[PDB]
């Protein structure tokens, strides 16, 4: 749940 958030935030930061 939190891990999901982390992964996604790593990917969204890229932009």
């Amino acid at each position, epitope marked *: 749940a939190v891990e*999901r958030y982390l*992964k*996604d935030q*790593q990917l969204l930061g*890229i*932009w």
Partner: nanobody
Amino acid sequence: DVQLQESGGGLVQPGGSLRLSCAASGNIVSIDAAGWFRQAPGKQREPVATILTGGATNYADSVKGRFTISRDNAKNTVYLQMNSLKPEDTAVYYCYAPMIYYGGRYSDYWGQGTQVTVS
């Protein structure tokens, strides 16, 4: 530990099509989200595409309409469908998989890259 491995690259004619795959050697770890980068001959590494854990997808402006990112969850593989290539797409393509669990610890992982040429 794990080693991401890109494949499906290679030579292709202008107007052609390719499908890149990215996976962990031996399927020992799942990939729930990932993204594709590319590096042109004399340019800066840039993001190309992204897919989150939820399924949400984002692309660079120079590839929207042409590329499609996706994943086969049963084989922990992520794909990049590349259509209507043009010489601007000539580059080395890298695979990025964040926060992968292995041997007691999370870590980000990169592939060694794959050549794509449009002549």
